[PDB]
Design a protein around this ligand. Structure first.
Ligand code: HEM
Ligand code: HEM
Ligand code: HEM
Ligand code: HEM
Ligand code: TRP
Ligand code: TRP
Ligand code: TRP
Ligand code: TRP
Ligand code: TRP
Ligand code: TRP
Ligand code: TRP
Ligand code: TRP
Lengths: 347, 351, 343, 353
């Protein structure tokens, strides 16, 4: 019964290539590569959305609470990063088209543009790209059911929100349990006092002063971790994304990552940072290619082109910026609150 | 006005995903990845066919005679190797599927298989894989997967001039082969004979030892192989055994381009021969990346397509599928620079 | 204060390039690429040995028994896979050397060869390639190096250390969860239940079933395992094989999640090691055609023979995919066993 | 008899791994990966310099004039691209180190940093990064990080002819620019003037609508930009600001090679100009891969080298470091195929091998 071509619906996939250059009586060879490249990107965007929606659902329905499901969650998020690595490398194919050959069919593209990629916007919204923090110069380019899908993607819970809620339930944050945050503040305070005492002991000098100057900056940054009102301020400015408690959960997972219950959660947090890193690399690879194709010419979508695309390579689009910035507060191993054999048994 | 999704016919591309697991009311999540991965490979096969047919046409219609067209030829053949590099890497995506999760939807695939990939067979044929070259199982079982217009397209792909045949005819016309002109082959036989005579004298001069006795036997091996190049009867014998594919005169053209590659008229031609070897290497790396994956997916299990599975696929990782094997094997006959026939001012100007 | 160049000992690393063509009064430009490529490969071989020895020691010193060390074990084995991926890709650099430019300095290399790569042999040995299964190596070494290589053959391999760990896999104990007994029962019921279905298209369905029955029930023949094991065609003990299959089937159970990742990584390393070998083959074919190597091998022909399951140490982890069954056949796990496989 | 290990001097290469964490009696496992990764980069930087210096010399000694050398020049410049491609991908290895594990040995590194990579600075200089276009970090020149011979070597790298200067000189001699010959620049201005006039007449002829106002606006913009290409004084201004790098005549040569790339004598030259943009693109991609990894390693911590760290590195991902920016920006002035000045059989014959 089942045949390869029918199974893969190749009657659709391999009959979707219509050169506008040809339609308008001036067939240009490289337009075919241009079409295929975009169609391959859109297939992989569909796969990323399939994986991403399935992970969002595992969080939203509480399946993530059952830790049996963590291999599936980390495997699928790792799989998204493996797909994004290919999409970054895939620009190398379209770069075998010269700007001069591109120029021969560019006129037939106006006013279509990548601003009309539904799936790219769905992908951005569902990971959790800030709606206000987008570069000043998006949903205007969409109508009908597509506009509806995009609104759903903006209103439904993002991977960021769902990871946030899960980080807020991380074991060990309980003030009457392990009391991670209280102990951490106590240990950092005591650690810094002892570091100062031994800087003071040294003989007055340009070096000692440099050492005091650096200690004072590091002290201010480390203790700023414990300033909740500062966090709330930076939250409202969109410079941070995660709730204060979610930050505590993530830092708990970082410090105690070798504890069996935190091993795969540490892999997940690593994977989320990988996905942000590969999405900005996708953007910058797109940028470097567009510079060769357009120079300083305006895009068919109405943007300044090259200059606009450069502005999207920015932490404005880094959804898990907080997971990166937590590296600001790494401390000597021996300052990390100790685990009692009971804390160990629970993890 | 033109819209992105309309331009790219995404109403077809993004409505072509039907999970057979779901159609039998037992939806398996990873079947979606399986479908997208094959669909992406088939889009790229279609692009390779588009590049490959355009280059076949440039050879067939004689446009290749105008050397203005050589940048276009080498760019498109290089583009094929860049696409094949991505397709080799693309297996890393499907390797994120465990054998256990694959096993949950495999039953819904039978009897469909990669043997029913029309485009993969069109690609093999159009580069110039011959029915004889295919491993016994593959040889006849390959055409028997296709009916109607699909079978018509495969017949055409075998009946029409292959890239091998078209490159061969072009290599036969390589400037410098002309016995009345630069007479490459005559001068090469003379210089290699003279070169071997000087080498035999150098070795014969050496103080007697074990190391001399070794060099003598090694020299005698190299002399046998190098002088065998000029035995056209031996060339024809190896053609019939399928050990060589190119005509004797095309082989001479290939060596001309290798030795004189820096001559301006042979610069892009040398890039093209490099690209043809690249495409053979990447086709066989594609085959071997597929083998390594299938081994983890099936172990010793037989394929849905009817083959032994892992064991069959290993047999396709063979030089019998290497269309431009002769371009690789010409490295057997590389000689010291100072043995290569000199070009005087007259022949340099012509190139 | 520490300085970058001093820290990295670049006084050594960047003063280690001597072109033999230039030493013999005939400097060939592309020999520099040739030297750097091999040196970069050897640095990464050293890094893989560093990771692989550290993981061997975690198994051998008992620390792997502490399941808090599994993240470290899988990260380091995954790191080996990421290094090998780069090393496969790294052939693309040396392939920018034409066979004709290589031919200009090849004469200065004899009789040196890759057969004299100490680290490559150490890597093969330490993963657990056995000397009797090698395609017809220590003859190429002397003194301290021949010594290090004998140690690499005599000391516990990653295959042996993983074998011993797989034998202790929870759920195998006959008095306990009794996985192997339960699995045989369920596959026996599974097959005779399908025969009943099939016997009630119809010709080929009877043939395919008897093929499947024969193979599946052959899994339970321990005598047959020991035969193929002694004949070098299998590598893991029968109990280790049961552990592996336990981890495959129950991989989602928290305590088996990172172990499954580890089994996936061991298969990735075999796959990438053979891909390294095959990329080396594809390049050497263009460089040499049918010429014999400076090492005294047939060259291209000998290298092809190393692209075989003779060199696939974890071949058993691949072949376990032969014996995969419908998931409803897998012995159900009660709340008693489920709680034992929680962290 | 030559031995593998002796040939590759592995007695040096594989005895250069000293963990500072171990030297201070606290050995950290991942410091070994850190050291090997930097050592591999430096081996490849040396190979890039070897290729780059060989190609600089082929231009400088005048051998580039004999067009039989063009396969060698393009092969070696493409080889630099292939190496840089691997170096971009190589960051994936060091990314298998967590920020937590890096934090366990970071203390033993200060005040060493990548600001002290002689070869990275040599590479930047020899391609043609402007010293006055470099981003500052401590109000002083990057070369303050170097002393003695290293400082001298970097000075020579700044002073000696860069790849940009050598390519520039060669572009100025591009056949077809000579006003008494093919007169490319004269014909191009004439053809663009005509092209724009015929384009205006076509817009003038449409019925008054938003579509016309769009086309009139879009047209007068394209008109301004294209005609600007012929303003030599505008080019000289932008050249002094460092917004352009190539002389006006070199720019003409590059555009000649773009438009007539298929002419046999311009085929390998067009490949070279493509390779030069690839190298700019792969160097900036190296910088951004470095940036993305460093964000996870340090967050907003200051660098051992005295920079702001992540924030400073983001500022080097900039057209300040794009040496062949003019080759990219020429795509601004691409025109319809039929506007390109026609080649008669005489110039066709002079641009054949
Ligand atoms: C010759 C190749 C390409 C050129 C010249 C190009 C040009 C542009 C330009 C100028 C923009 C900004 C909007 C505008 O004014 O049009 C843009 C945005 C975009 N392009 Fe491309 N593009 C190319 C290839 C691709 C490919 C292969 C993809 C694959 C999906 C893609 C996806 C996008 C997306 C998703 C956007 C929206 C990005 C954002 O707003 O952040 N582009 N492109
Ligand atoms: C789980 C993944 C895969 C498995 C288990 C698999 C298995 C097989 C098997 C067993 C065969 C031999 C014919 C048969 O008996 O069925 C085969 C052939 C083939 N497969 Fe795959 N395959 C996989 C993925 C892919 C992908 C992604 C492609 C992409 C196009 C592909 C393309 C082919 C082609 C073209 C053939 C025919 C090759 C030849 O005859 O030389 N396969 N595959
Ligand atoms: C032009 C490039 C190369 C050629 C022609 C070449 C050739 C050969 C040949 C002929 C052999 C078989 C032994 C012999 O007869 O000499 C061999 C083995 C080997 N080569 Fe290479 N090789 C090349 C590049 C490399 C590189 C870059 C590495 C990196 C370390 C390498 C590592 C090895 C190793 C480890 C072996 C032993 C493999 C085994 O016994 O399975 N080769 N090579
Ligand atoms: C954990 C990994 C790494 C970290 C955290 C790191 C951090 C930094 C930082 C902070 C700087 C700015 C100067 C400073 O204040 O120290 C820098 C510059 C640099 N790093 Fe790295 N780096 C890493 C890996 C590497 C590697 C593997 C290379 C390989 C050569 C490298 C090469 C450089 C170079 C050349 C610079 C100077 C770049 C410029 O000025 O534009 N780094 N790095
Ligand atoms: N699985 C539990 C506990 C939990 C929440 N966040 C975590 C992070 C790491 C480990 C466990 C947890 C839950 O989802 O509520
Ligand atoms: N926006 C591109 C054109 C383009 C790129 N990708 C596309 C996909 C569809 C339609 C148009 C495009 C330009 O300005 O040149
Ligand atoms: N272009 C000419 C001459 C030619 C044939 N083969 C070649 C190989 C290399 C260079 C030139 C040629 C032709 O097609 O007949
Ligand atoms: N032949 C494969 C199944 C398979 C792989 N790729 C496919 C694509 C379409 C249909 C079936 C397949 C097997 O034996 O398991
Ligand atoms: N950690 C225990 C139990 C164990 C052995 N092998 C395993 C495999 C998976 C999970 C647990 C185990 C041990 O080393 O003896
Ligand atoms: N064995 C290779 C030469 C070779 C490859 N890699 C080497 C490293 C060191 C010494 C020699 C080599 C040949 O036969 O051509
Ligand atoms: N080879 C000649 C002519 C030349 C200069 N630049 C070029 C660019 C492309 C083609 C030829 C040239 C020279 O060096 O003066
Ligand atoms: N500058 C880095 C440390 C570093 C990265 N690479 C190095 C090489 C040598 C010495 C130090 C380094 C930091 O701030 O953490």
């Amino acid at each position: 019964g089942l045949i390869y071509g029918n199974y893969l619906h190749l009657e659709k996939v391999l009959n979707a290539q219509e050169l506008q250059s040809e339609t308008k009586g001036n067939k240009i060879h490289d337009e075919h590569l241009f079409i295929i490249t975009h169609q391959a990107y859109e297939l992989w965007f569909k796969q990323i959305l399939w994986e991403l929606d399935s992970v969002r659902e595992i969080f939203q329905n509480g399946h993530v609470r059952d830790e049996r499901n963590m291999l599936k969650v980390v495997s699928r998020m790792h799989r998204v990063s493996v797909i994004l690595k290919l999409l970054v490398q895939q620009f190398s194919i379209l770069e075998t088209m010269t700007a001069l050959d591109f120029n021969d069919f560019r006129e037939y593209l106006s006013p279509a543009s990548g601003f009309q990629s539904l799936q790219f916007r769905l992908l951005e919204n569902k990971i959790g790209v800030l709606q206000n923090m987008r570069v000043p110069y998006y949903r205007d380019n969409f109508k009908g059911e597509e506009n509806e899908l995009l609104l759903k993607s903006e209103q439904e819970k993002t991977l960021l929100e769902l990871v946030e809620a899960w980080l807020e339930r991380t074991p060990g944050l309980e003030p009457h349990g392990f009391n991670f945050w209280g102990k951490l503040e106590k240990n950092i305070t005591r650690g810094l006092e002892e570091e100062f005492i031994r800087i003071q002991a040294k003989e007055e000098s340009e070096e000692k002063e440099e050492q005091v100057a650096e200690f004072q900056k590091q002290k201010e940054v480390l203790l700023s971790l414990f300033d909740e009102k500062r966090h709330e301020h930076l939250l409202s400015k969109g410079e941070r994304r995660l709730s204060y408690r979610a930050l505590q959960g993530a830092l708990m997972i970082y410090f105690y990552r070798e504890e069996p219950r935190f091993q795969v959660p540490f892999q997940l947090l690593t994977s989320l940072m990988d996905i942000d890193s590969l999405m900005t690399k996708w953007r910058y690879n797109h940028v470097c290619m567009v510079h060769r194709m357009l120079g300083s010419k305006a895009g068919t979508g109405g943007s300044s082109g090259y200059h606009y695309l450069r502005s999207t390579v920015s932490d404005r689009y880094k959804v898990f910026v907080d997971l990166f910035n937590l590296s600001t507060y790494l401390i000597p191993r021996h300052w990390i609150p100790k685990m009692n054999p009971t804390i160990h048994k629970f993890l």
